[PDB]
From Swiss-Prot:
One of its GO terms (cellular component) is glutamatergic synapse. One of its GO terms (molecular function) is metal ion binding. This is cAMP and cAMP-inhibited cGMP 3',5'-cyclic phosphodiesterase 10A. Abundant in the putamen and caudate nucleus regions of brain and testis, moderately expressed in the thyroid gland, pituitary gland, thalamus and cerebellum. The gene is PDE10A. Belongs to the cyclic nucleotide phosphodiesterase family. It comes from the Eukaryota. A divalent metal cation 1 binds at H72, H106, D107, D217. It is found in: Cytoplasm, Cytosol. 3',5'-cyclic GMP binds at H68, Q269. It is linked to Dyskinesia, limb and orofacial, infantile-onset: An autosomal recessive, early-onset hyperkinetic movement disorder characterized by axial hypotonia, dyskinesia of the limbs and trunk, orofacial dyskinesia, drooling, and dysarthria. The severity of the hyperkinesis is variable. Striatal degeneration, autosomal dominant 2: An autosomal dominant disorder characterized by striatal degeneration and dysfunction of basal ganglia, resulting in hyperkinesis. The keyword Ligase does not apply. Plays a role in signal transduction by regulating the intracellular concentration of cyclic nucleotides. Can hydrolyze both cAMP and cGMP, but has higher affinity for cAMP and is more efficient with cAMP as substrate. May play a critical role in regulating cAMP and cGMP levels in the striatum, a region of the brain that contributes to the control of movement and cognition.
Amino acid sequence: GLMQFTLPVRLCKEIELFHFDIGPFENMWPGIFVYMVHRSCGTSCFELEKLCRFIMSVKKNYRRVPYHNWKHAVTVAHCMYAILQNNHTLFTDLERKGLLIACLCHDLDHRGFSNSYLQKFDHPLAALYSTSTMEQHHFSQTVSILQLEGHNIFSTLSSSEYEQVLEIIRKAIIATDLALYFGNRKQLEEMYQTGSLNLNNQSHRDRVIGLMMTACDLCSVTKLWPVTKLTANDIYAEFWAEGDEMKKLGIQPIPMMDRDKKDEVPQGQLGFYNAVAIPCYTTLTQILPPTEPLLKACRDNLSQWEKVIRGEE
Ligand SMILES: O=c1[nH]cc(-c2ccncc2)cc1CCc1ccccc1
Ligand SMILES: [Mg+2]
Ligand SMILES: [Zn+2]
């Protein structure tokens, strides 16, 4: 356990910031992840040999899709890490352990398609799981990987702690279903304004961790503009392939997914920042004030999209 992980100076400093980009070197992503677990949870919360084997099995089960890939998994885990490090005392030993793993695992074996497309195509996963289709799959793949010989990073936990951490991970991954986000934020909003929000209420924690998962999952909108803009290209590469596949089933896709309607991209972003990103990070800052930088960066990027529309770039 005397084996620390250390990053080069620039990464060591930049990694603490909400807008850190993990960079184009795939082979450094596992070290970045281990470094985040060690600083977030202690050097003592996982057997390194088991952690390393788990990370490489998780990596192996992300597919080579334009956006919902291994890079996304680590980007989302880094954002969660920035949140946990800026709210040290608000989270239990187990929550910290569970949530970084939840984030690395949250999109396992994603095929590049929405729950909507699964249902319309009539994929087997849509009969097996009627709602949060991909998200029940991702949690399923997580549990499968935990049961591979030498992969149970949670072996040291008491039997009850083990059930607590797998329940934190399960609610965490399900919460990445953006259809569940809207109600979840409205309830948190109401509960914080009426003053009822109580973090000793497990069901209240659940909702808050759900909102953090949405915040970490959407964190491309909180980066520096060139990262945000270039991540949007990869996001649209999947959306447009899905629209192509909708058209192949005889269905007109929503314009966001229709590569004929690229013209409408800037206005689509406006919609999304106003309907989703800004409310998400607004509510998140109200409940966890040290996450304000996510809201500020999101606001700057909305402003950058406004400039794109006004032909100023
Ligand atoms: O970072 C993201 N991750 C996921 C989403 C998303 C959109 C719709 N449904 C589910 C998740 C959008 C963004 C960024 C904003 C964005 C970029 C590109 C296209 C449209 C919106
Ligand atoms: Mg997902
Ligand atoms: Zn995701």
